[PDB]
């Protein structure tokens, strides 16, 4: 019943400003401090600052004194964090969290907003089939792949044989480089399976409303 509602993701331009929202429900909004926490990919939690809604008294981590501006609208039970002069070092997940005086700590957290700071426009991926070297399959198995290049924003959903083939799959996290994403997926099957049977990669990119199949053909 206590809930803190944050947007799941926001894409924003470098040098621009963004206002991140945290809408509280299930308790009296002015009763608790709202805290903000930054987490960079694969890194730790970093405390940014806090606000007491009503009087709007605040505390800041000195590292964020100019970067973050904290406000609150009691009429909508919403806390806001403004991030200014955006750079790639601002790309992160930002959580809001409620402080409880009894626990002396953070008892409820928002889902976090994934902020992506980028110049990129929405772009459908190119999907390339990865067939093995025309060497030889005297191994008991064979590995095939799918390369998904040049898309923006996240995510893509990749399946094999429309989801019929789910075992032996590794779908790798996307990497953003030169302001487009690339990802890849491998699937491993017994040698008797391919190329005797069809194996196709299916790639959905909901931001561009595209879906693309690529059959893996022997070289």
């Amino acid at each position: 019943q206590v809930q803190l509602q944050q947007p799941g993701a926001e894409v924003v331009k470098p040098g621009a400003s963004v206002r991140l929202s945290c809408k509280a429900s299930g308790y009296s909004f002015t009763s608790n401090w709202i805290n903000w926490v930054k987490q960079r990919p694969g890194q730790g939690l970093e405390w940014i600052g806090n606000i007491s809604p009503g009087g709007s008294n605040t505390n800041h981590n000195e590292k964020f004194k100019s970067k973050a501006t904290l406000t609150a609208d009691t009429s909508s039970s919403t806390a806001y964090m403004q991030l200014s002069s955006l750079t790639s070092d601002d790309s992160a997940v930002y959580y809001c969290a409620r402080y409880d005086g009894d626990y002396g700590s953070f008892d409820y957290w928002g889902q976090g907003t994934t902020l992506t700071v980028s110049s990129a426009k929405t772009t459908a991926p190119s999907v390339y089939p990865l067939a093995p070297v025309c060497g030889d399959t005297t191994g008991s198995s064979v590995t095939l792949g799918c390369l998904v290049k040049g898309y923006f924003p996240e995510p893509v959903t990749l399946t094999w044989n429309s989801g019929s083939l789910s075992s032996g799959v590794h779908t790798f996290p996307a990497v953003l480089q030169s302001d487009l994403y690339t990802l890849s997926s491998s699937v491993t099957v017994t040698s008797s399976t391919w190329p005797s049977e069809s194996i196709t990669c299916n790639v959905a990119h909901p931001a561009s409303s595209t879906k693309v199949d690529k059959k893996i053909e022997p070289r």
Binding site: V37, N59, Y103, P132, T143, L147
Partner: protein
């Protein structure tokens, strides 16, 4: 202000084992310390508050202890749901700093990577690009390195790497490495090589093809 020193940064453990994680504050923080758990892809969740008190509904196998500058979180007979990361945080004064985290990882038997190399697709070449891909799959432990060579010469530029989290079925790790060239550069050279260095292979496992 107060600095928190958390240890260990990482540990490989098995279900049923007992684990102790430590936090050290720069000054006496008088038990004003919380511990959180964070599962992959999820928000942190409070386990222990005021150094020693279990939050509402938290399993009794978790316990916190300490005073002064020295705090611990103990997990007594770890269960499957307990793998993930843990963080301490103090509330002595502003800023309310977190420890750097402890990641718990599932122990399993060592496994050499299965290495596969892939030439550019005809499709990509028609568009004027040339990506060569190397999968280093189902290995354990986590640490690994890949080196590219073109005609026997190490190539560092144009390489993108990605790593999976621990596999839900077999607890291994995998890695993908993509070397991206122009089609013109790709077609000038003859041989392409991916080399995997791992605990199980300090002399690398080498996969190559000739264009």
């Amino acid at each position: 202000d107060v600095q928190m020193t958390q240890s260990p940064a990482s540990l490989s453990v098995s279900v049923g084992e007992t684990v102790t994680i430590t936090c050290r504050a720069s000054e006496n923080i008088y038990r004003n310390l919380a511990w959180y758990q964070q599962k992959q892809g999820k928000s942190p969740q409070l386990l222990v508050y005021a150094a020693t008190n279990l939050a509402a509904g938290v399993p009794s196998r978790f316990s916190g202890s300490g005073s002064g500058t020295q705090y611990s979180l103990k997990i007594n007979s770890l269960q499957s749901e307990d793998f993930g990361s843990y963080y301490c945080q103090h509330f002595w004064n502003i800023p309310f700093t977190f420890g750097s985290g402890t990641k718990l990882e599932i122990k399993r038997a060592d496994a050499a990577p299965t290495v596969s190399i892939f030439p550019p697709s005809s499709e990509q070449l028609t568009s004027g690009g040339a990506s060569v891909v190397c999968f280093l799959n189902n290995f354990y432990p986590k640490d690994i390195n890949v080196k590219w060579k073109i005609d026997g010469s190490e190539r560092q530029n144009g390489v993108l790497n990605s790593w999976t989290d621990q596999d839900s079925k077999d607890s291994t790790y995998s890695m993908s490495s993509t070397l991206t060239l122009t089609k013109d550069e790709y077609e000038r050279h003859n041989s392409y090589t991916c080399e995997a260095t791992h605990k199980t292979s300090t002399s690398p496992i080498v996969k190559s093809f000739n264009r």
